Design a protein around this nucleic acid. Structure first.
Lengths: 157, 132, 63, 98, 226, 228, 52
RNA sequence: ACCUAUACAUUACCGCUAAAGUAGAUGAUUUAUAUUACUUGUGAUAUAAAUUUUGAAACUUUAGUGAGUAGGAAGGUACAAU
RNA sequence: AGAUCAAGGUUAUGAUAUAAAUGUCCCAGUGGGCCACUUUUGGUAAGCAGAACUGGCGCUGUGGGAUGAACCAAACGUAAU
RNA sequence: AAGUGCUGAUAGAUUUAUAUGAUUACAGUGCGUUAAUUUUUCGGAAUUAUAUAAUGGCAUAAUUAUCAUUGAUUUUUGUGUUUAUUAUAUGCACUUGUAUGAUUAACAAUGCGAAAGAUUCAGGAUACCUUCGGGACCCGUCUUGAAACACGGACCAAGGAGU
């Protein structure tokens, strides 16, 4: 009985398509004879354009340690662990303001008022979507409630 | 300016910040430098949770970047021009530091000769300051 | 970690004498050459007998 | 050490060091498998073609449903039995020697 | 003279090389016989069972030799005479393992550590993957892992008869009379830690579940733990 | 000759070549050309090909290690085909909705604006920068002008001044864009070619009057679980 | 244990193989098939005894 | 389904314990070439070139391994005068 | 019982050996201890005393019951995962 | 149980191998029999016999041995047989080329060690100050036990106890 479920959901590889490995539809269609393809709805909220917003929530805190070489994030789009795994491997970048310039504009133009350390998210951590993240240096400690970002780089389909 | 020495890598050290001697905060009869506090109660001797990271053989550097100053060499004491003839052919390896009992008479004789011997000093311009 | 770095992990016996000679070292700096090309047991017992103190490198009378 | 009385008895100039101390994985290096273990090539090159004919065995259902091609992507992949018939006509004409 | 040195090397340059080509045949002739030793046996239990169903008999499976023993609990808070038994199987650290040759005479050595060891009977795919993945070997009492077929052959060739990694399989997974020297030859492994976890680590298997006479569900562990 | 049998590219353990060369050899009569050139030979009559001692000497210098000098690896990319309009995230030209043209053997992928409509050139971008989109903009029967290439559009060159070397340099010199006049014509060859195919399609989100504004999206629409 | 080994090797001195002369306890045995043969199953002793 | 330890595993690194290798450099060693003995083809010669140093108390290499007061030995540095 | 010939299998239970084997300095210390489970006297008894067999605390940090020398995980070279 | 077949990632990459000793050997490439079958027709494509111990399939001979024994497990094999199978029957030079010496590296960008002068990129609690997150009793010592509601310590320079 489950043998067509080894078959029918290769129609996504037949509707994308690639080598077309299924003839039965699984279309999510409006037809009365088309009541399948089984979405794990619902959620309807973007948080994905560029610098898709996600505020920050302290380090990968033990109860009585820190391990501040890493950091942990709060990703406002996501709310189940199937959501957040689309944020694997993105960079993580956070700007924060300061006084002087001290650097010329040579690699593409900078009058230099903004200052920003950098980094890279890795893996999904919390069973609702909190996804820990490592930086270039270390997340400067007073940011627990600053509006850090995640840009789309790099991405796929 | 000077060619950097002889297979210059990333000098990357384990623990860098200095090591400051349990309870040297509230006694200024207590100096800066460390003494493993050998007495039976202590709060750091037991390698506890919070205190001034306790030294051992771990923290050292690699056994090729031993002694390696931030410009590739290993530092070396120099006195007069004859010991700069020791740095004749090794010039691409080590450097020199002009010993601070040398006056500005004799330090005129290092900085004009060993420049052409292509060695590096840490300190020229000691008393130069182009006066006597 | 485990527990055994127990005792003795420590091979006691002597590697080189507490003696700063330049003649006795010249035998050592020769007879280290002639026990690490051949494997002959007779050379090693020469080498391990180049190491005891004044006593126990025994006196030995002619009869 | 000149000597002509010592270096007729010396034995070993092991000039090469023979260190080569690196380990390797038995799945991520498929290259490793045959080296430490031949017959690992056998079990792959047995079951791989069995999967490979089975890749033909399910596109022919699509070539049963729609019957489109079979032009140059799998037409020559199924016309090889006509060449492989000749691999068994020798079983009918060249294997008749014993 | 080094002119006469040239014949000693270049012949040996062919002699050490050409025997590898023979060893390539030697490491192939065993394994091609080694494979279907499993396969006849894998069909042998279907044939004995189903015939006994046709002949209306209860066919028992064979009770097994070849256990495999992985430590669970520390170095400390250990019982009195379980300190010498556990140095007498070379389990010392947590998550290290060796094998045994089972009889009664190791059960009542295994029972007097049975709260602290979790011993099981492996399948095919564990033992192939064990010496492969986290297997090291022990020549001249050191620990230099695998990297070729050489690290068995160099020191098991004359007095014992083993020279390929699937032949060291043969004198353990099939159990034989050279076995006792065929796993002091291994250093204890270093198994990692099995993700998903350990389910409780409290008790013996058959009330709460962990250490002990588990003997068949050891394979769902070693797919993770190693 | 023949029967190369390289099935070393889908298994990936298949070799299948030793199974041929048993009877495939002729088993006797070895005849081959056997080039035995002694040409690297110091015939220093007036020649002096030792080589001549410009140095032959011990100028002491130590240089970085003999690296692998690796091969331009095959290019694993997600399955998408030109033409597909895509959202540029980069190049100081973010937000433009631009279309694939041609993949290149450097692991690169040709995109144009076009400069006629989008006011964007024939920019080559990374696949990791750019988010792929859903459906097809049909560009099957195109002229595929592959004569424009990667090495055709490298920086040319590091001369440090005026193709002469040791000369005088000035602040803010220009050597990397006029931009080139042929690329304007190379734009003109495809912009006239792309307008007829892009306006004949049934109109959509980024097709005719539709691509030219700057990605920005209302709620209840996904980066997450869209069949995107 | 001595004089058997002097005699069971002595009978082994006419065929050669094999000595088998050390000591081994009981082993994991075999894999039978077992007919009932004797009285098919159930045979169901299930306790109920507390109340007394 | 997740959660955290200086525990477990793997890559580097430190010191320590164990094991192992290296000294005819008025040589060794390739790279070419002239030749040759020619043994098909392997070797010796000659030319040209370049690599070849350390308190053998050195040097290379290999594995394992590291808590600690009471206490014992191990090399390391201050402040002295002869 | 001893010496000395004659015959003799593969040496005779498992599993190891992080190496085994010993003579000095009688080598510095230390000769007051504490606790839980079972086993247990004295007492009605106690965070008391009094013990045999282990493990631990003193010598020991540690992750966990907020806390706490012993409880339960684990016994502490510097580092990332 | 079999690479069944990927698709997506994480951080990490020893190596002055003479600064006192294969840079070699496995494999992959282009050159010198063959015959047609087949397909594309632009290549490719597909063909055996050439030799084996053959190793299974089957058949019978034969035996060691077996819970059992109609038997079946086998053992030693011995032979026949077709059917599968694999490795051996690749020298000669060449190649940025596979793998091998703790197997990480082609590309690209960013920049002139600019007479003196001096911008750029990372790092840098050197010992502060500034801004936040966890940690955290304040030091000797007798004792089973000291953060002690146990004793000694106001601060500092010089002197002091294994001769």
């Amino acid at each position: 009985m489950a043998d067509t479920q080894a078959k029918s959901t290769t129609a996504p590889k037949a509707a994308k398509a690639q080598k077309a490995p299924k003839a039965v539809k699984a279309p999510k269609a409006e037809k009365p004879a088309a009541s399948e393809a089984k979405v794990s709805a619902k959620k309807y909220k973007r948080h994905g354009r560029l610098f898709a917003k996600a505020v920050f929530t302290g380090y990968k805190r033990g109860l009585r340690n820190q391990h501040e070489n890493q950091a942990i994030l709060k990703i406002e789009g996501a709310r189940r662990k199937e959501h957040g795994s689309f944020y694997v491997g993105k960079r993580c970048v956070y700007v924060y303001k300061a006084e002087t310039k001290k650097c010329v504009p040579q690699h593409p133009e900078r009058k230099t008022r903004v200052r920003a350390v950098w980094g890279k998210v890795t893996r999904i951590h919390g069973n609702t979507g909190a996804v820990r993240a490592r930086f270039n240096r270390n997340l400067p400690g007073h940011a627990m409630g600053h509006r850090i970002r995640i840009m789309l780089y790099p991405s796929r389909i | 300016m000077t060619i950097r020495p002889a297979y210059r890598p990333k000098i990357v050290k384990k623990r860098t910040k200095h090591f400051i001697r349990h309870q040297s905060d509230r006694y200024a009869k207590l100096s800066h430098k460390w003494r493993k506090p050998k007495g039976i109660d202590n709060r750091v001797r037991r390698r506890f949770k919070g205190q001034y990271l306790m030294p051992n053989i771990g923290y050292g550097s690699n056994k090729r970047t031993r002694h390696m100053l931030p410009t590739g060499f290993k530092k070396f004491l120099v006195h007069n021009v004859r010991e700069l003839e020791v740095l004749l052919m090794q010039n691409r390896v080590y450097c020199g530091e002009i010993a601070h009992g040398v006056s500005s008479k004799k330090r005129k004789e290092i900085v004009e000769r060993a420049k052409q011997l292509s060695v590096r000093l840490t300190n020229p311009n000691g008393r130069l300051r182009s006066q006597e | 970690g485990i527990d055994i770095n127990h005792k003795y992990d420590r091979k006691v016996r002597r590697t080189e004498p507490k003696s700063q000679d330049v003649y006795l070292r010249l035998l050592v700096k020769l007879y280290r050459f002639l026990q690490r090309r051949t494997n002959k047991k007779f050379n090693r017992i020469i080498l391990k007998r180049l190491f005891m103190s004044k006593i126990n490198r025994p006196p030995l009378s002619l009869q | 050490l000149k000597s002509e009385e010592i270096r007729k008895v010396l034995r070993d100039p092991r000039k090469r060091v023979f260190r080569s101390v690196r380990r390797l994985n038995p799945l991520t290096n498929v290259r490793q498998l045959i080296k430490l273990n031949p017959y690992a090539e056998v079990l792959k090159r047995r079951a791989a073609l069995a999967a490979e004919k089975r890749t033909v065995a399910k596109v022919l259902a699509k070539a049963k449903k729609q019957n489109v091609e079979l032009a140059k992507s799998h037409f020559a992949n199924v016309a090889t039995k006509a060449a492989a018939n000749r691999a068994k006509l020798l079983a009918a004409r060249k294997k008749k020697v014993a | 003279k080094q002119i006469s040195k040239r014949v000693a090397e270049s012949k040996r340059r062919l002699k050490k090389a050409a025997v590898i080509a023979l060893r390539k045949k030697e490491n192939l002739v065993r394994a091609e016989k080694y494979q279907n030793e499993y396969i006849k046996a894998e069909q042998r239990e279907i044939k004995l069972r189903r015939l006994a169903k046709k002949r209306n008999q209860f066919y028992v499976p064979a009770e097994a030799k070849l256990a495999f023993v992985v430590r669970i609990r520390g170095i400390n808070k250990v019982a009195p005479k379980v300190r010498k038994v556990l140095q007498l199987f070379r389990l010392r650290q947590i998550n290290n393992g060796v094998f045994i040759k089972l009889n009664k005479a190791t059960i009542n050595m295994l029972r007097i550590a049975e709260p602290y060891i979790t011993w099981g009977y492996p399948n095919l795919k564990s033992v192939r993957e064990l010496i492969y993945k986290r297997g090291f070997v022990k020549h001249n009492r050191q620990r230099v892992p695998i990297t070729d077929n050489f690290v068995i052959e160099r020191k098991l060739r004359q007095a014992h008869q083993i020279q390929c990694v699937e032949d060291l399989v043969h004198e353990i997974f099939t159990v034989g009379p050279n076995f006792k020297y065929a796993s002091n030859f291994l250093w204890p492994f270093k198994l990692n830690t099995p993700t998903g976890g350990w389910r409780k680590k409290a008790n013996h298997y058959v009330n709460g579940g962990d250490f002990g006479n588990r003997e068949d569900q050891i394979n769902r562990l070693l797919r993770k733990m190693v | 000759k023949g029967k190369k049998h390289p099935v070393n590219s889908y298994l990936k353990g298949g070799i299948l070549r030793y199974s041929k060369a048993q009877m495939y050899k002729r088993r006797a009569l070895y005849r081959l050309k056997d080039k035995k050139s002694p040409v690297v030979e110091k015939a220093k009559v007036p020649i002096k090909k030792s080589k001549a001692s410009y140095p032959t000497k011990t100028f002491v210098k130590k240089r970085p290690s003999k690296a692998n000098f690796s091969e331009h690896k095959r290019n694993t990319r997600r399955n998408l085909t030109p033409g597909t309009v895509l959202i540029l995230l980069a190049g100081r030209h973010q937000g433009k909705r631009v279309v694939l043209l041609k993949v290149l053997a450097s692991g690169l992928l040709l995109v144009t604006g076009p400069f006629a409509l989008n006011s964007c050139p024939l920019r080559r971008v990374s696949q990791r920068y750019v988010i792929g989109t859903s459906s097809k903009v049909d560009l099957g029967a195109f002229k595929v002008p592959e004569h424009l290439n990667d090495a055709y559009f490298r920086r040319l060159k590091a001369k440090k001044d005026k193709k002469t070397g040791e000369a005088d340099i000035f602040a803010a010199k220009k050597e990397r864009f006029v931009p080139n006049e042929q690329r304007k014509k190379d734009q003109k060859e495809v912009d006239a070619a792309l307008l007829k195919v892009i306006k004949a399609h049934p109109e959509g989100k980024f097709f005719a009057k539709y691509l030219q504004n700057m990605f920005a999206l209302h709620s209840s629409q996904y980066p997450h679980r869209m069949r995107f | 244990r001595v004089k058997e080994n002097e005699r069971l090797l002595k009978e082994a001195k006419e065929k050669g193989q094999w000595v088998s002369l050390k000591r081994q306890p009981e082993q994991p045995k075999k894999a039978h098939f077992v007919k009932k043969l004797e009285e098919p199953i159930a045979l169901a002793p299930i306790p109920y005894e507390f109340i007394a």
